[PDB]
Structure 1
Amino acid sequence: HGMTPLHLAAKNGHDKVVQLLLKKGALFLSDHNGWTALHHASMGGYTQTMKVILDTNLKCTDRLDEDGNTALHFAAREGHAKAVALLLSHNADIVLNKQQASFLHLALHNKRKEVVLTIIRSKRWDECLKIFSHNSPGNKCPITEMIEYLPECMKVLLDFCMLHSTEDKSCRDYYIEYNFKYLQCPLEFTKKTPTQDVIYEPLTALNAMVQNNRIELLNHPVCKEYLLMKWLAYGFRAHMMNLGSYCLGLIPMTILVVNIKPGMAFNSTGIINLDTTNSYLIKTCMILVFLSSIFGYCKEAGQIFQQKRNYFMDISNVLEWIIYTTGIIFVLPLFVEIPAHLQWQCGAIAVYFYWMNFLLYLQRFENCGIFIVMLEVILKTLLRSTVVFIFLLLAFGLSFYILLNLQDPFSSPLLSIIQTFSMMLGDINYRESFLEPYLRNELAHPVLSFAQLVSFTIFVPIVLMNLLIGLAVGDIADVQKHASLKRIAMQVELHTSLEKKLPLWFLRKVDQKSTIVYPNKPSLEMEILKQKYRLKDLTFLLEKQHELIKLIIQKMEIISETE
């Protein structure tokens, strides 16, 4: 295999005999696959063998194998923390292999926890952080694999960002400075540019956290301060213009509804009925709803300019389009008169859909936003079972239309279905509909009507409504299972989508990347996977041990026991 005795002595890690060969001269040759003695001594973690090798010439510390791995690549791949600490105390170069992986990438892929802690806690940590290469599917930015593979060592990295620079706890001059140097690109790689070929979407470490389910990293005090920095920079401001422009039409609609009697029409001069009392209030709320609606057109027309053909795959946008037209038809007597029946018909649609859509604007919160996610997932699985409702209401509604035909609730087929839909909750009347018609001999088919009554009561209020309850219990259960991550991922996706459309010069102004906080001045499957790796190297050691014992019997003096 081309191994010199220097290779064999360093492979099994015999430091005294590897000192003897260097005392004579060994030239540090490379075998087949191009490994020197330092590649063998590192793959094995014989730091005492690596030490005497590294004190001779330093001409071997930067050699490359057939894949271009240096000695730090092997010591970090097999997880020898004292070997990489020795190989970094000496200024051995940090490079990439043929697969564009640094030694930090190999330790992260092989999940070597004690190695990457010695990479972080030692010097040269920034220069192996920036040593990665782009345009590579594996071996990305070293932070992103640290989220992806070793989140506990990212927590140690975040502890280095949270510095105090003080020792007087609960003092007036006491402060905790949070640094966000590891949570973000420098924002030039966030926007598409011909000079910036990198297309890293912003909030890189936090978007990696919500993808890799790292909830313990998201609740870190550096990441909480980072989101609160992003909130106060532009997140609270952009949320207040969006909610503020909506309330500019929401509130004057509600003032206009509760101050005018919903029958008759009204000019801007007042109610026609002609009242002309508090006509200043009616005029400005008429004006404010009209301007907020045409602001909502330009808000929606600006949304289709930024989102082409994926705008129309959203159901919330058609709610806004109902909202803004019916707002205008409610206040169209600013310019042209309309019938009072049409005005309040569009008024009832507008004031209903305003508050239904205002429910969606608090989805971008934390204390009450999880109930809108629960409301959406229950509503989605009710519209997924809507055909079972249609066929049950057609079964019971058309049969009740035949049986109870002489009663006014069941006179047309389209009033039989609505009444059957009203009896769905358990509001079967049974006295004015079943019993008192039966005692007056007004039931045409008495025995079928009571049989349809019993079969209705079993199916729809008992069985069907308990099905929707049991659907909703399971749907809330898996939402609450991921609820703590969902509210943080909604905050991250908010700020990610916000500064994706913000200009870069504005983002340079509001970002501050390091905040100073004065405190006193104003779980089981991971244990099994750790145990499987702790057993996989145990059986690897035992097989390596077994060939040694087989070698002992192979080379042993036997004279007294020769049968």
Structure 2
Amino acid sequence: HGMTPLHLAAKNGHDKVVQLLLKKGALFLSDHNGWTALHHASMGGYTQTMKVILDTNLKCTDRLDEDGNTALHFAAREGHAKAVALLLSHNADIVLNKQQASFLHLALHNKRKEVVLTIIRSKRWDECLKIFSHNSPGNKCPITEMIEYLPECMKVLLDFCMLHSTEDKSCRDYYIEYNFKYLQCPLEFTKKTPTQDVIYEPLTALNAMVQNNRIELLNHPVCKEYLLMKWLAYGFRAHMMNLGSYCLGLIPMTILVVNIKPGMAFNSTGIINLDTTNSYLIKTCMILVFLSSIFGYCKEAGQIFQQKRNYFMDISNVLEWIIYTTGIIFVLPLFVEIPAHLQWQCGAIAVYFYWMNFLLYLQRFENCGIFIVMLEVILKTLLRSTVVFIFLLLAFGLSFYILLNLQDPFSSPLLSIIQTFSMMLGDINYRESFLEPYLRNELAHPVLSFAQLVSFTIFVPIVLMNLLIGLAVGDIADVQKHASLKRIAMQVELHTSLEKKLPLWFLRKVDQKSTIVYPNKPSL
């Protein structure tokens, strides 16, 4: 294998023969694979011969193998924390291999926890932090890969960001300074910054956290302060402006509907019935709906400008489309006269769909959003059971249409399905639709209809209803398994969807990169 005896001595870790050969000199040959003697000592982790071999000319400290690794990689690959402390005590260069991996990446790949804890505790940390190279599938970023592999040392790194700098606990001048230098701007790490194919989305460290579900790292205090930094800077401001635009449409409808008797028509000047009472109220909300709904068009037409052919996959967009188009023709007597029965017919579409859509806007919250995603996921599985519903309902509906034809709740086949749909929730009209017809001999098929009723009462209100309950229980327990993560994931994905469309000059003004918080002034 071309190994000199200096290689063979440092491979098995005997300091004195390494010390003996260095008295006569072995010139640090490279073998096959180009390993130096320092590589073999770094491979085994024998720090004692590594100390003796770092007192010569140290021309092997920057030597490379056939794959481009130096000795710092091999100590970091095989988990020898005392070795990398000894190597970083001297001026070990940090050069990637020909797979574009630094020594920090190999320790992160081979999960050497005590090694990277010695990297983070020692000096020289920032230049091996910035030594990573982009456009490589592995070896992406030392922060993000620490998220992906070893969260617990990343937690220890976050304790270095959180410094109190004030020993007097619970004092008026007591403060805590948080640093956010390790949570964002991954292009700000590299001092060269070519930014050729740099397509980094915002909040890389946070997005890697919810993608690697490291929920113990999300509830770390500097992460909450980092979220609250982004939330208070722009995040509360934009979310208020989005909701406040929609609330400026929703509230003036609701004021308009509870002040007008829902049969009548109205000009801008009041009710025809001519009332002409509180017309100053009716004129301003009728305008305020009409102005807000036009803004909803330009909000949506602006949204199809950002997204072509992805806009149409959402169900909320056709929900938002049906929001505005009736609210125009609800308040359309600002301009042109429409018949009254039309005007309220779109109105009942509007005020029902407004609050139903308004349920969706509060999904972006921290304390009530977990019910909205639970309400959606139950509704999805109920929608998948629609063909079970339709074929069950139309079975019992048509048979009741035959058997109970003489009674007006089943006079029409369409009506019989709806009455069967109202019979679903246990509201079986047993007396005034079965029994009193039977005691007046008004049932054409008495033995069948009772047998149809008993077979109905088995299937729909008992079996089918407990099936939906049993679906909802297993569905909710699936969601609440990750409920604490899902709220923070919706918090993170909100901002990353928001900062992607925000102009970059505004970002430099609004970010502050650090914060000062006074505490006492205001698994298996």
CA shift in 2, pair 1:192/1:266, >3 Å:
farther
Helix, strand or coil at the partner of 1:190: coil
Offset of residue 98 of structure 1: 1.1
Contact kept, 8 Å, 1:191 with 1:500, in 2: the verdict is no
Looking at structure 1, the residues matched to 151 and 215 of structure 2 have their Cα atoms a distance apart, in angstroms, of 10
Looking at structure 2, the residues matched to 161 and 401 of structure 1 have their Cα atoms a distance apart, in angstroms, of 73
Offset of residue 413 of structure 1: 0.6
Looking at structure 2, the residues matched to 340 and 191 of structure 1 have their Cα atoms a distance apart, in angstroms, of 69
Contact kept, 8 Å, 2:9 with 2:18, in 1: the verdict is yes
Contact kept, 8 Å, 1:76 with 1:84, in 2: the verdict is yes
Contact kept, 8 Å, 2:42 with 2:72, in 1: the verdict is yes
Offset of residue 191 of structure 1: 18
Looking at structure 2, the residues matched to 242 and 216 of structure 1 have their Cα atoms a distance apart, in angstroms, of 31
Offset of residue 307 of structure 1: 1.1
CA shift in 2, pair 1:367/1:192, >3 Å:
farther
Where does residue 261 of structure 2 map in the other structure? 261
CA shift in 2, pair 1:191/1:164, >3 Å:
closer
CA shift in 2, pair 1:193/1:111, >3 Å:
closer
CA shift in 2, pair 1:406/1:458, >3 Å:
same
Of 177-186 and 126-135, the range deviating more from structure 2: 177-186
Offset of residue 331 of structure 1: 0.2
Helix, strand or coil at the partner of 2:223: helix
Contact kept, 8 Å, 1:162 with 1:176, in 2: the verdict is yes
Looking at structure 1, the residues matched to 192 and 342 of structure 2 have their Cα atoms a distance apart, in angstroms, of 49
Looking at structure 2, the residues matched to 73 and 205 of structure 1 have their Cα atoms a distance apart, in angstroms, of 25
Contact kept, 8 Å, 1:190 with 1:500, in 2: the verdict is no
Contact kept, 8 Å, 1:188 with 1:196, in 2: the verdict is no
Offset of residue 189 of structure 1: 11
1:461-520 Cα shifts (integer Å, max 9, x gaps): 000000000000001001000000000000000000001000000011111110000001
Contact kept, 8 Å, 1:69 with 1:97, in 2: the verdict is yes
CA shift in 2, pair 1:115/1:172, >3 Å:
same
Q: Which ranges of 4 or more aligned residues in structure 1 deviate by more than 6 Å?
A: 187-194
Looking at structure 1, the residues matched to 129 and 314 of structure 2 have their Cα atoms a distance apart, in angstroms, of 40
CA shift in 2, pair 1:194/1:458, >3 Å:
farther
TM-score, normalised by the number of residues in structure 1 = 0.91
Contact kept, 8 Å, 1:75 with 1:84, in 2: the verdict is yes
Where does residue 132 of structure 2 map in the other structure? 132
How many residues align structurally?
524
1:398-451 Cα shifts (integer Å, max 9, x gaps): 000000000000011100000000000000011011000000000000001000
1:281-329 Cα shifts (integer Å, max 9, x gaps): 0000100000000000000001100111100000001111111010011
Offset of residue 197 of structure 1: 2.1
Q: Is the counterpart of residue 49 in structure 1 residue 49 in structure 2? A: yes
Q: Is the counterpart of residue 381 in structure 1 residue 352 in structure 2? A: no
Equivalent residues in 2 for 1:358-369, closer than 5 Å: 358-369=358-369
1:221-253 Cα shifts (integer Å, max 9, x gaps): 000000000001110000001000001010000
1:325-352 Cα shifts (integer Å, max 9, x gaps): 1001110000001000000001000000
Offset of residue 190 of structure 1: 14
Residue identity over aligned pairs, in percent, reads 100
1:15-74 Cα shifts (integer Å, max 9, x gaps): 011000000110000111100100000001110100100001111111101101100000
Q: Is the counterpart of residue 331 in structure 1 residue 342 in structure 2? A: no
CA shift in 2, pair 1:445/1:189, >3 Å:
farther
Contact kept, 8 Å, 1:189 with 1:196, in 2: the verdict is no
Offset of residue 185 of structure 1: 1.3
Contact kept, 8 Å, 1:190 with 1:201, in 2: the verdict is no
CA shift in 2, pair 1:52/1:192, >3 Å:
closer
CA shift in 2, pair 1:320/1:210, >3 Å:
same
Contact kept, 8 Å, 1:396 with 1:456, in 2: the verdict is yes
CA shift in 2, pair 1:26/1:194, >3 Å:
closer
Offset of residue 196 of structure 1: 4.6
1:151-194 Cα shifts (integer Å, max 9, x gaps): 00100010010011110001111110011001001678999999
Contact kept, 8 Å, 2:45 with 2:75, in 1: the verdict is yes
Contact kept, 8 Å, 1:68 with 1:97, in 2: the verdict is yes
CA shift in 2, pair 1:116/1:189, >3 Å:
closer
Helix, strand or coil at the partner of 1:271: coil
Helix, strand or coil at the partner of 1:489: helix
Contact kept, 8 Å, 1:190 with 1:200, in 2: the verdict is no
CA shift in 2, pair 1:187/1:240, >3 Å:
farther
Contact kept, 8 Å, 2:81 with 2:118, in 1: the verdict is yes
CA shift in 2, pair 1:57/1:191, >3 Å:
closer
Q: CA RMSD in A?
A: 3.9
Contact kept, 8 Å, 2:28 with 2:36, in 1: the verdict is yes
Equivalent residues in 2 for 1:66-465, closer than 5 Å: 66-185=66-185, 196-465=196-465
Helix, strand or coil at the partner of 1:178: strand
Contact kept, 8 Å, 2:147 with 2:209, in 1: the verdict is yes
Helix, strand or coil at the partner of 2:364: coil
Helix, strand or coil at the partner of 1:428: coil
Contact kept, 8 Å, 2:268 with 2:334, in 1: the verdict is yes
Contact kept, 8 Å, 2:95 with 2:131, in 1: the verdict is yes
Contact kept, 8 Å, 1:190 with 1:199, in 2: the verdict is no
Listed as ranges, the gaps of 5+ residues in structure 2 are none
Helix, strand or coil at the partner of 1:91: coil
Looking at structure 2, the residues matched to 188 and 112 of structure 1 have their Cα atoms a distance apart, in angstroms, of 27
CA shift in 2, pair 1:41/1:371, >3 Å:
same
Helix, strand or coil at the partner of 2:177: strand
Contact kept, 8 Å, 2:135 with 2:197, in 1: the verdict is no
